[PDB]
Write a protein that binds this DNA or RNA. Structure first.
Length: 54
RNA sequence: GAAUCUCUUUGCCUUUUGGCUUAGAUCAAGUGUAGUAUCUGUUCUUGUAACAACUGAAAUGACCUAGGCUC
């Protein structure tokens, strides 16, 4: 669980580093959700392709 | 030209979500397993007369400085 949390944090940090945002807290949650979805897809062996994802 | 108000579109907006794990597990089972705790009614519970004695209690309020008499 701890490891997962750490990973999530790292990902969030990376995303923050990446580009400018206004009211980023809200977006953080979304990012986390996306990450989770991706992980799930990987587990399943579904390709995680989302069109809006830059 | 300037002040303001009303409506529509674009931008900005929760055109929708704050974790992880074996999709967390299962849509099944004479269950097994461990523990923790005590109950039924039926009964006990002298009169009459005379003499000696008192005629009356309690409540709160009216006087005086808890106490003392009167109503």
């Amino acid at each position: 669980a701890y490891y997962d949390l750490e990973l999530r944090n790292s990902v969030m940090d990376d995303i923050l580093e990446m580009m400018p945002e206004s009211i980023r807290q809200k977006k953080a949650r979304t990012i986390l959700q996306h990450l989770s979805e991706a992980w799930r897809c990987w587990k399943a062996n579904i390709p995680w392709d989302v069109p809006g994802m830059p």
